[model samples]
Target: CFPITLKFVDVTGMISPGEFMAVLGPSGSGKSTLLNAVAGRLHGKILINDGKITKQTLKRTGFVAQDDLLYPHLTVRETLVFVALLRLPRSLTRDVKLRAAESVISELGLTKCENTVVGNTFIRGISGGERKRVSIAHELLINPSLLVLDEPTSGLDATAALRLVQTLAGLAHGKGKTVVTSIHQPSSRVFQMFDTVLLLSEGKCLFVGKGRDAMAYFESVGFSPAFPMNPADFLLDLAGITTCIATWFSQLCILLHRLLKERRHESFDLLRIFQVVAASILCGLMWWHSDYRDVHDRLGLLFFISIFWGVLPSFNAVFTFPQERAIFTRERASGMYTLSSYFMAHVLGSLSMELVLPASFLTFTYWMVYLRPGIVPFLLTLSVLLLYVLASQGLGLALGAAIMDAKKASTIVTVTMLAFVLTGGYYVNKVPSGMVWMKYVSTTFYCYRLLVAIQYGSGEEILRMLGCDTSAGCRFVEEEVIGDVGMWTSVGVLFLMFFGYRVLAYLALRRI
Candidate 1:
């Protein structure tokens, strides 16, 4: 059995199975830290030992860490459906997930904003309090049996603040959930309503007891300063400052569907559409209808295609996570989805764009230039370019994730691509012997060889002048360029780099 436990030195308390426990204290108290600790561990040293939470006992959990993780363009209901798909079991049908989305949408009183975008600061969709509720509504889809929240009512006014707390109370008492949340301050109406109150001051646990008894207990200690003061406010003056979950199939589908939707709404890179079409036209014109006499030109065209696809895909992919991560990491910590699942779904969604542009670009440029006439050769060549694009994208992902900085990673990818180009066989054929191993690692090397082999192998003229004598050039192209590495070998290596770089990317993102 893989066992996990959480131990805390200064926090010791007992909260009944159906209770709303509020971690209340002033700013700088370690309330957020404690909520974080509890979210990750089932058995807490702070929880009374006899009632330890068991894995079988807790099948699912809900969390609301920050209100900003919602998709800026998705409506309140749309956001929940994606989360339900992402967070729940695979056995669940899409209809069920949809129902669950609306169930929680109504549960948290979000029905009014159900169709409105949960927009960010710049976009206007819902009110401040409603975003907080939508964030709450996300986790509540799993019925919110076991819940942890950090400042759920942070930006709310007095009326809504009290309303949210009462909702928490109902979730705990009415629905039998054990809800714990961290709050900086709770108004008197809110403070008086918690089933259990936990107060922290200067990293120390000050009081943990039933709500009604907290004031009684504080006064019992000979500190009875009662007035118009809120119990939560009164507790703050007392002291001072201080400080994974996963599954499978359900993950990939949910994540892919959502990310596809994400790309549709967010990654509208018309710049790409314009450039790809424009580039295809320009490129085809440059090498229009090549001849055996223009072997050098065809080779140059092949290399340029590599540069166009490789450089463009990698440049954009490298920027994918650098800025998107605080949002990603926060959701990961919230137990929304597993690392492997997101990585796979991410790659799958990316292929949406990867295939669309490259497919169109190749078809346009392939017939336009008239390099290889046979359909068989065109298919194989297209496969090579597609495979090459994925591998290059993976390289960028690996570098971007490791460096965790886009600007630096972009330049580094550019340098690496340039270096690979010179070693890619045409630009620097002799390859300086000492640096020949670089060819083995160069994506361009594999793709270039594959392109040359099929284009020349069918007709066999360029290989004649370059490597063969008489008709030996056709055999000689394979003899030299494809030596030791069959076209299959090129395919194998490109496949390896594609998978390998993505795995490296995942590993890099996994690091703290």
Candidate 2:
């Protein structure tokens, strides 16, 4: 059993409206945990506006994380617009939200990069300082009364970091929004911008008062910075010496609109689309006009198609959440939207692209493969493959959400899909009586069973034509292998997996 030891206790402080407070602490002095506690992220008793921090209290609070959790594909203006849609009151018109975003753009001095993309490692876009400004602007869009940030100047250079602090001072003084942030190694000029300083050491509040008075208060307490030393450094060394340390349709609409915007950009990855189309062509040629001359060829064709649909979509999905994890966590923390709303938005945003591209792929491969004639069988084949794709996509979503690292998630997906393929009924049709239960979990197995049924309806003829003799054991094998699993039953199972994996993804996100 794990025991509990509280990190913070008996701490109290008040941030006046329109005041800028800078929290300084050494490594484990509870700088962030304090801010998180106030933001209603961690469970604790803290009062704001004469009320304890709760969901209602948090509606007026804004939280900006150290990392700029923004979508790389969206332009700065688009990012702010999306935030406005979610954070702004629903009673406001769309025009008002856009106007509010435009105002924040002007206020934050991001007018220059307003149209620029917020690029990540794969893309080049705004400068580091500008990106930080965009992040601040995101919180500002909500017009929250209380704004808390964690290490807003983590990676910026001296000049940029000072400018960011200056901007924060401006926001507090100009907009009457109480601003609190945990800062690291502030310059003398940056230090002068704070209205108040809360210094902590070993989980104890050493000092809390005006920034200029910190030195005076420290001297009275028998600690004084040597003349000409950076005050922030002196305070830091002293601290180091201490040694230590959803569900509403209205929320749904905003999340849906924002996510779809991002997905729309990602869905157009020319490389991804081209790969699918090219693979369809290659697979079509590989199974070129697959005939019934030998049962082996037709069987291999159906199994291969099932495995293709199962593996491709899921592996592609592993990358989705790794990138969006930061953004989703930040927004969800700020009370921007519900997890259900976010989950539903993702499912819907991806549905159209998933269906259209796979349908295009089937167009190239299905007709080329000489399976059963008649539109009914063709549609059944396509429908099964498409459902399997969605199911695999759900699995990918779960992997992506559960494992934040894309590389790690990819390995897990690869191993899991390989397992599915092994038990998929092609490689091990009989599945060893002792391990027969494996097929029950293999989505590929159900899909392959359905596809075989669609292509070779009523196993009697196909069994006899494949040279099965009039033997009791041969008949038993045919019925057990093909006829035992009903087509719609497998179809139902595929749909169940689609739902199950998505629910798993939602649960995984909740843990984060």
Against the true structure, candidate 2 reaches a TM-score of 0.79
Q: lDDT tens digits, residues 373-456, model 2?
A: 779887877888888888888998899989789899999999999988998766654557788887788888888888777767
Query: Candidate 2 — what's its lDDT?
Result: 0.78
lDDT value, candidate 1, whole model: 0.75
In order, the Cα lDDT scores of the candidates are: 0.75, 0.78
Predicted model with the maximum TM-score? 2
The number of the candidate with the highest lDDT is: 2
